[PDB]
Write an enzyme that holds these catalytic residues in place. Sequence first.
Site: not given
Length: 566
Positions: A83, A161, A185
């Site tokens: 990420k 996210s 997330s």
Amino acid sequence: IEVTEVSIAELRDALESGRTTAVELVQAYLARIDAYDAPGTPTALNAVVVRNPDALAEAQASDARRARGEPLGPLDGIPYTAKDSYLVKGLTAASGSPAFKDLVAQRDAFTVERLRAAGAICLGKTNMPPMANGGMQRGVYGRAESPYNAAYLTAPFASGSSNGAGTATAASFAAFGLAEETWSSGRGPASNNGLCAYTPSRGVISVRGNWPLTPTMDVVVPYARSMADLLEILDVVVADDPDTRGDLWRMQPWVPIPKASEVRPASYPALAAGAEALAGKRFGVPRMFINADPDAGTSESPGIGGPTGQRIHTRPSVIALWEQARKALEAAGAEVIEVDFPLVSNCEGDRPGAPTVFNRGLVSKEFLHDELWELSAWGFDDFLRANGDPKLNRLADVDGPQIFPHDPGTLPNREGDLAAGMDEYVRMAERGIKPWDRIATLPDGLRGLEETRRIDLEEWMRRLRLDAVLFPTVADVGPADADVNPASADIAWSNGVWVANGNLAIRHLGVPTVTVPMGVMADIGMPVGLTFAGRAYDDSALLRFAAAFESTGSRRIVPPRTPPLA
């Protein structure tokens, strides 16, 4: 060789027998990214947003080690993605924010350090909304799309996210992925993409070098297509980090936090088991997540904002998958009991007599305010200082209005004005930020959070004699046009859909969870997961339960939009 839906063990076997090389693997994954992820392709999933240009050179060095008969370990030569909140040395770390689009990582995050030392190869970084302060909102790189059904989102709209990590791992753009969770997330994107994911208890995986959002809540979350792969990752990454900087729960002196080396088992892959590990166990399913709680939302003014405290309307095809999961658990010798869920009801005040986190008195209103503002401002500023990019290393030098700008033409954020909200953090830095250890409300707050979990979860599970709590990870999935279509936004912003089941209580109270695929909704072809949750630091047993459940069936499918090439 083919890499689509291939496990880490198969890859290592191929590397060891000479059936392939690390370079050939990297090329096979980059080929899938170029065919399905890049702009101008028919699918244009837009999951991988920053490439690692040294990936092929790193693969070269890995094969040189192997030819010299000295691999660094089980993950030497295995590609992954991280990420965009992870610091990967030499690459940008914008956290999806336009304000940080040029920030360059001067070092690795702890997780990345462990993987680099093991010879794993980061192919690049995955998409996310600005500062992880959302779900599917478009950041500096846009947003990722679903590899299962273009008509629905790849993650919950308000808290999902890690939306690039979910798409990328499900589409076999790498062997595994790294994500992060503040509310949901991590669990959110895993559910919509048929992934296995693990949210650890506090202090198990250092968050140093990870962009913070809410320092009391942030945790690292690995993604994988199978439980066996998930355990391969943990074997390598879980270890004591001598540097505590930025990791609030490993710095603070008021709450006893065990060392990572005290929590992990000697061997994570040994946690795998068959159905025998479910025999004689007692699992409770909250009525509120299977359309069995008419009392939810019956107080005078339920919730703590947004759709919280409201009755959850779970999709019928998700209920049908839950019923089959229950049958499988019962066929394996387990007992499944429908129960309340004080952890959520006493956070959101969803029925008469139930308190909220704001009026219960276990944590103070002032602590909850400092948590959102003063403590988070310190988190941002100290992360920038620790990274030490000469061009941008202080929060007060950031372009406030560009931290989280609104996407023109889309509907308003129902949580408020987040462009002005984030800009306020720069105004705070300009006035001076108190460090974490000088915030007066912190000692009682951290102890109050642990106290809440003890009363609402740990002692509760003891008297019910529960081994774990489980439920569908999400109640439904929002349509892909929830950003511009009012009818779609109503669904996407409803309770159980805007955020994975559990809302804020799960991460606020440090509850460990493991999520695995529960199946694919027959009506719209979207995956949905099953989440196991339990007592703090019972992570090993939860991992074993998840592995055992996974073994009773084959509930994952290859995404139809990203088939094997050629």
